[PDB]
Amino acid sequence: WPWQVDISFDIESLGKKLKDLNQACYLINHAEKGLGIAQSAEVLHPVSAFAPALGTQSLGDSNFRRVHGVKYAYYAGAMANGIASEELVIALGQAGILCSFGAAGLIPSRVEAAIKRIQAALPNGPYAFNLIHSPSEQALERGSVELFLKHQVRTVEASAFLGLTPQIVYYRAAGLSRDASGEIVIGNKVIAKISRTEVATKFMEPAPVKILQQLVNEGLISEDQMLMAQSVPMADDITAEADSGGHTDNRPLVTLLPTILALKDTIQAKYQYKTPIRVGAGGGIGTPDAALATFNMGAAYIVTGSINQACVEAGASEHTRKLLATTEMADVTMAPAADMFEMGVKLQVVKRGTLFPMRANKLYEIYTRYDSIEAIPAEERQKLEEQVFRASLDEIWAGTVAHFNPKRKMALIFRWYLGLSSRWSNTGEVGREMDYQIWAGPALGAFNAWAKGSYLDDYRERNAVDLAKHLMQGAAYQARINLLLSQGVSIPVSLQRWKPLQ
Amino acid sequence: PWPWQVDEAAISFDIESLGKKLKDLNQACYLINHAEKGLGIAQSAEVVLHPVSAFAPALGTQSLGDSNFRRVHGVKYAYYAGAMANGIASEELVIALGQAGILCSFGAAGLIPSRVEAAIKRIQAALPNGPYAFNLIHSPSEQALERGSVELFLKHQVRTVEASAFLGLTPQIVYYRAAGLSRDASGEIVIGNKVIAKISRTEVATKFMEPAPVKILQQLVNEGLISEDQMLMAQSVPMADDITAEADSGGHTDNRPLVTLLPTILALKDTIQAKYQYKTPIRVGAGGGIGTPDAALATFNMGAAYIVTGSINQACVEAGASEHTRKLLATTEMADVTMAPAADMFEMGVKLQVVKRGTLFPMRANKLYEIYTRYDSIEAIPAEERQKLEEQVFRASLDEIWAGTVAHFNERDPKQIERALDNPKRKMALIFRWYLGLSSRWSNTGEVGREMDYQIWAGPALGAFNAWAKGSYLDDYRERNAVDLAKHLMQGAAYQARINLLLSQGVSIPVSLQRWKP
Ligand SMILES: Cc1cc2nc3c(=O)[nH]c(=O)nc-3n(C[C@H](O)[C@H](O)[C@H](O)COP(=O)(O)O)c2cc1C
Ligand SMILES: Cc1cc2nc3c(=O)[nH]c(=O)nc-3n(C[C@H](O)[C@H](O)[C@H](O)COP(=O)(O)O)c2cc1C
Ligand SMILES: [Ca+2]
Numbered sequence A: 001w002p003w004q005v006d007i008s009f010d011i012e013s014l015g016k017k018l019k020d021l022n023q024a025c026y027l028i029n030h031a032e033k034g035l036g037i038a039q040s041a042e043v044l045h046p047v048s049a050f051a052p053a054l055g056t057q058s059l060g061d062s063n064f065r066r067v068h069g070v071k072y073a074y075y076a077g078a079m080a081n082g083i084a085s086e087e088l089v090i091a092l093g094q095a096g097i098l099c100s101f102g103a104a105g106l107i108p109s110r111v112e113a114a115i116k117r118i119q120a121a122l123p124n125g126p127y128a129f130n131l132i133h134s135p136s137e138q139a140l141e142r143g144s145v146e147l148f149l150k151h152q153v154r155t156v157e158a159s160a161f162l163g164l165t166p167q168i169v170y171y172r173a174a175g176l177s178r179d180a181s182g183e184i185v186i187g188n189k190v191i192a193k194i195s196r197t198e199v200a201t202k203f204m205e206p207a208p209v210k211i212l213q214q215l216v217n218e219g220l221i222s223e224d225q226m227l228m229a230q231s232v233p234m235a236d237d238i239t240a241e242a243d244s245g246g247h248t249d250n251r252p253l254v255t256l257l258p259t260i261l262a263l264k265d266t267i268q269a270k271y272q273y274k275t276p277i278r279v280g281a282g283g284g285i286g287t288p289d290a291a292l293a294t295f296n297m298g299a300a301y302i303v304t305g306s307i308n309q310a311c312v313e314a315g316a317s318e319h320t321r322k323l324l325a326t327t328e329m330a331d332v333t334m335a336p337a338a339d340m341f342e343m344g345v346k347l348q349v350v351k352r353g354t355l356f357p358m359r360a361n362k363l364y365e366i367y368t369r370y371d372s373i374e375a376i377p378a379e380e381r382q383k384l385e386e387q388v389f390r391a392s393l394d395e396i397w398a399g400t401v402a403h404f405n406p407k408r409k410m411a412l413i414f415r416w417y418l419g420l421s422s423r424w425s426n427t428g429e430v431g432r433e434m435d436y437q438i439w440a441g442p443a444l445g446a447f448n449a450w451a452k453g454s455y456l457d458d459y460r461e462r463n464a465v466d467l468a469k470h471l472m473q474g475a476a477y478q479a480r481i482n483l484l485l486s487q488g489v490s491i492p493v494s495l496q497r498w499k500p501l502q
Numbered sequence B: 001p002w003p004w005q006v007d008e009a010a011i012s013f014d015i016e017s018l019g020k021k022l023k024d025l026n027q028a029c030y031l032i033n034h035a036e037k038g039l040g041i042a043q044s045a046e047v048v049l050h051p052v053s054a055f056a057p058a059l060g061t062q063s064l065g066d067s068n069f070r071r072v073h074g075v076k077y078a079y080y081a082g083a084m085a086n087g088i089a090s091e092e093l094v095i096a097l098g099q100a101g102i103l104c105s106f107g108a109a110g111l112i113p114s115r116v117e118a119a120i121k122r123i124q125a126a127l128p129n130g131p132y133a134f135n136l137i138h139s140p141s142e143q144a145l146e147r148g149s150v151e152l153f154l155k156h157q158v159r160t161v162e163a164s165a166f167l168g169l170t171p172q173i174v175y176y177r178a179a180g181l182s183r184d185a186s187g188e189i190v191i192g193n194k195v196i197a198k199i200s201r202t203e204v205a206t207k208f209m210e211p212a213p214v215k216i217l218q219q220l221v222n223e224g225l226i227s228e229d230q231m232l233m234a235q236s237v238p239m240a241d242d243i244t245a246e247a248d249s250g251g252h253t254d255n256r257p258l259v260t261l262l263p264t265i266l267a268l269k270d271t272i273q274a275k276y277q278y279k280t281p282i283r284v285g286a287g288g289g290i291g292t293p294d295a296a297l298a299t300f301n302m303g304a305a306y307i308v309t310g311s312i313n314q315a316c317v318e319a320g321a322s323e324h325t326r327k328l329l330a331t332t333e334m335a336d337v338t339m340a341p342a343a344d345m346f347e348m349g350v351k352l353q354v355v356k357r358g359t360l361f362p363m364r365a366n367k368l369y370e371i372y373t374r375y376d377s378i379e380a381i382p383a384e385e386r387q388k389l390e391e392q393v394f395r396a397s398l399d400e401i402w403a404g405t406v407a408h409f410n411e412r413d414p415k416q417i418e419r420a421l422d423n424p425k426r427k428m429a430l431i432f433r434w435y436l437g438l439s440s441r442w443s444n445t446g447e448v449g450r451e452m453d454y455q456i457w458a459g460p461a462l463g464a465f466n467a468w469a470k471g472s473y474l475d476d477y478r479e480r481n482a483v484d485l486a487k488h489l490m491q492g493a494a495y496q497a498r499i500n501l502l503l504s505q506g507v508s509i510p511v512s513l514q515r516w517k518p
């Protein structure tokens, strides 16, 4: 290196200079004091190692930040039933951070209200809305899309898809237009969250002609839109969702992400889109360490979820938040999902401080083993009635009927619990604590452990914005440390990691 | 920020040339954003003609991982190929890796002592100065056997053991460690017998990071097995030099996320190292999920001293696995693995990670656990379900299987047969375990006609590998050499570090150059 200097061997000061990512670091050894650092040099103590000013903006894909209009290559993933609440979106968006409104499970009127509120607060973004695939209820998907289009909601996080549907195709294609120069403008942005290559492929490739044609025919998109749709991917960003809270197939981040990046390279080479497809990732990200790891694999951006439910902005009860602050990595497990209960799908939930997973598991065993509720041995039937429902199955069924084969009846009854248990947690239903269904992964325990001993120990002091900052600033910090280490600098262990001190 | 300038015609804008130069890790890279032709790159600069807008130093694989790991183990990369049972991590594998300066752990688990001794002799002939290791697997039921292995290792001066499946210390692993301790000419401690402990739980890591306890040491001294000075020395050095954090992986696993497990173990390391202040610090590396350069890089950059591979090595021509298996393994995609009942600890619900494409083992094994748990006894299994097992799985009556098992365990370990009845559950388990046991052997040896029952250990790392490799010469199983894979992961990781660097400076690197490809 070409520099020399004439500052500093003061350990506390070493920490301060290292942590200022807005300034370059010039490193000196000598003897003693034996590692020194300066923030200015000149083209006579020469310089042994260097780190440039590289901050949070240096992580991830700059195009992600440009396209979404955000300060970080980060987003807070949707959380069902308004858990990713209006307050959450607004707080994050006010900070220049992307967040997906948790539309899943909410009624249309509720979603409309959220749109209005969010748009009032964030007239020029950033924000996204969750569009969840609803296999059983196509009309509902159509409805959400119409709403989004009606209000010019420009960004959607598409999740739980098994491939394309006419509704997501419609959203995508309806946003396309030509600029003065004749180039395609992609007005409706899509972030497709996936865990399989088969589905990723569908979103990385253009929409099919036949679906497009029907949309033209139905008067939903224009001929040119149909044409344009054939030359742009179905999503701008692909979120690889590894092992995570909620619905998940438990794939390792370190294998999923690389696999999807491989796929990306393949598709990009084949289509040569003018704007390259981006691949980001989530699932397991609760620390600076994990955040950096994910960027380091080639993630365009990172996604958090579990840690955000723990924050004061989230639509989750005080009880629940409090409990989330104590939840360790061993305190989560797989349990039956209300959605696709019948096929045995499971989701990752909290199992300490609640009996939900045991109870859900019981409902599945019973559902699968009996023909009808009548076949359930008056025996365990009565314990269910006592411990789970707190009312005869018949009475549950009556309520259900007012909310409007025997196997189907049994499911409908059981889904009362599977469904309401999530609501109970979200709203804080008193006396129903032991039945709270609370979605979370190992990310949360990771976070908690990382934060132990800090101000973050108090659930009341957890703000989504702050968490984002820690992950991003921490990652950036640790990137600098790696750079110096790579060069043979002896950074003291106590400075090697970003910890929450303030 | 950059104090150099560069004369044109040293610069290229050529994309073929960009790639070549980026990939040359022995030379630094000076980048310039020219009005045109845009991105340029040179490998020499002035110091005052265009100014430099981005830089990457010459930094190669040696900057990855812990240099002490390399010095201590006498290897050229901070990497090791993990043990694979029943000789899957074969003599051929160990030799090929060791000959290249790459650490490999011989798969001694399940092999008989004479076989292990033969292995030792062959390996030591080929590698008189290393590097190599031997797997010492904990056998909770069978301390005499663990004892024999250590005895064999000490006899032949096998200096490096990969200690796996431990739940804590045992007198055998302690003996191994302590017996290797000597003084140098200055009186300093020499750690002759190196130990790499592979763990997934903090409770176990802790034991291996701390010194051997007084009580066991004292015992060894009393038995005449180690000297008093060796006992003294043992109190100042860790039980293991290296701790491998094993995340989600092929074979036995508790499916821990690498991105949460490794930082947890590193933090523990820091704590213990700070407490004991060992002259040579304890190190933590990691495996589980490492099948690509991206993953390798991220792992190093989390703080791993080294990386460990396992699933990908089984796929290589040196592995002690059948040609059929190896060929299969090249077809395995990331979702083509699943958890299945383990033969070892079947009854306790222990599972392991196996291939589920091109073999029905997992489906069949899972069915067995289902049946075992559901029914009181073999006689209670619905006639037609039991029939389908006999046709499709056992290829014989359950009573014929039982017959063989009795005969077998009566010559080997009659305790099982005794214990197992009156108690139909245990008898049923014993019968089912016949399949769980042999299915591995079938794969390893390539039993003809038992292809759909092959038990083949593997995690998603293999799938990621296959995806990474797709379209390359590596598509052909016959072209997969362990050394080559190691080198690809190491060099690729180095390459990606440079790419990341440059990207972080805002350099527009073409998508096709962002990842290291075969
Ligand atoms: C309580 C909770 C609710 C969630 N709800 C949704 C949802 O409705 N739709 C969706 O696509 N993802 C949902 N997610 C997934 C997150 O958006 C994110 O992808 C995931 O949580 C990241 O993994 P992590 O849990 O390891 O952080 C939810 C996650 C949690 C923890
Ligand atoms: C087929 C196979 C056999 C293995 N046998 C052993 C063994 O006998 N002892 C052991 O400690 N680890 C064993 N392992 C684990 C590997 O040594 C290594 O730790 C692990 O495979 C790395 O994770 P990965 O599968 O994601 O690469 C085995 C792994 C595989 C795939
Ligand atoms: Ca999820």
Ligand SMILES: [Ca+2]
Pocket (backbone or CB within 6 Å): B246, B249, B250, B251, B252, B253
């Ligand atoms: Ca394993």
